[PDB]
Amino acid sequence: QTTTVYSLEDLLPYLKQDNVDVKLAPGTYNVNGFDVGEDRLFSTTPLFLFEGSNSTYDFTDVKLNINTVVLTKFGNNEVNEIQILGNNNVLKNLKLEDIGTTAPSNRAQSIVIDGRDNRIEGFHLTIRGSYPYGYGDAFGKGGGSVINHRKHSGVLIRGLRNHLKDCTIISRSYGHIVFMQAASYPTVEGCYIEGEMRSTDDMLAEEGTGSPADKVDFMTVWGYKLPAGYMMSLQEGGIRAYNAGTTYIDGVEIQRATDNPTVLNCTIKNARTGVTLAHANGTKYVEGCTVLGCENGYSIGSGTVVNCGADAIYGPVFKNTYGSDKGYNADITILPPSDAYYNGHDAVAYIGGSNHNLTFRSEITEIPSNLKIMVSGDLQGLRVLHGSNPSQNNFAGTNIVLRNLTNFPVDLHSDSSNITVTSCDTDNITDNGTNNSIEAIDC
């Protein structure tokens, strides 16, 4: 029942057909700049456009090497390596590596999943080639940038009931690693998602070199000179949901927020955020995840984080996004450090909004002197200093259960009220709020 093909050329016609079972034979396949053109293997982007439905594609033992020069071969357009437009497809086991670090002429996204009921499983993706690479988002991630960008993101999940399962996504590119736009009921499950880090002190050491950041005197899009003392990802989000986007299902163009995301059993390392779903609507559910060395652990706005862990070396394990957050239930283990601490945010968690039920658990006994659980107050977060992003800082918290089964101190700011705190120790809790309850628990 399976048709086997032995070249990319012979693969491409099947992507236009429904109800096919296709295998690209084990081997190595190289896409270079000479493969893009009118009489060339790829005359259009997306390179691999899966238009059919009800199809299965086996890429076991396939290594697909795509030279980053290809990101410049389509004019000023966005380039996407793989897009799925049909429904009910399964793509499995591909190892896809971007070769070199050439930046897109405009921007790129490795995989885009539209349609409904598709699954990408067993992929190993290495994403490269973007600009500027080395500053994270300090000089701009959208419009009005201080340094204009050519971003390149990994997997963009859209559509309906789309599933990324058991994949390894390694990014050495400035872009999100896995992100969701206009996606209804997406699921990310069993994935390992990894970026890399650079300190702001190392960025500031470019002074006098003539680098792009040196030429703008390190003035960030946040409205202040880049501060020393933080560790940034060179990527954007590990898993990040958007409140907007465009998708296509069954010939219908759809503009909507992400809704009903589920994240299960993922490990996210060295990204700007581990799991951020606050901008999605519907039910948010996160279970069984591990977040290591990210700038932020979990921010889902409302919903459930259960049986999840994060270390706190570079940023807080938990952050309420806005004072509008309501009904965020979380059970988070503060994991042993994955490297030396370099957390300039001066917090292990920042809590606010209302009607949350939050449990933190840890075996940590060496508590860095600058780290505490904050309920309300003025977070020294890299992107929220000096009034930057004002809705994301300095907000009230009300009617919150805080079970602190850790040795970290807790600081209840004057804008906190009706906080029910239980803690292993209460000697290191400061209470400047209103009608808060503090009670000791045994271990």
Numbering used by the authors: 1 to 443
What does the study report here?
FdlA from Flavobacterium sp. SA-0082 is an endo-type fucoidan-degrading enzyme that cleaves the sulfated fuco-glucuronomannan (SFGM) through a lytic mechanism. We show that the FdlA-NTD adopts a right-handed parallel β-helix fold, and possesses a substrate binding site composed of a long groove and a unique alkaline pocket. Our structural, biochemical, and enzymological analyses strongly suggest that FdlA-NTD utilizes catalytic residues different from other β-helix polysaccharide lyases, potentially representing a novel polysaccharide lyase family.
The FdlA-NTD molecule contains 13 coils, with coils 1–6 being complete, while the other coils lacking either PB1 or PB3. The T3 loops at coils 1–9 together with the adjacent PB1 sheets form a 30-Å long concave groove at the surface of the β-helix. In contrast to other PL enzymes, which form a planar groove, FdlA-NTD extends its C-terminal part of the surficial groove into a deep pocket, measuring 11 Å × 13 Å × 8 Å. The region comprising the deep pocket and the C-terminal part of the groove (between coil 5 and coil 9) is characterized by a strong positive charge, which is unfavorable for metal binding due to the electrostatic repulsion. In addition to these common stacks and ladders, we also found an unusual cysteine ladder composed of five cysteine residues (Cys168, Cys192, Cys267, Cys290, Cys309) that are located at the T2-PB3 juncture of coils 4–8, beneath the potential substrate binding groove.
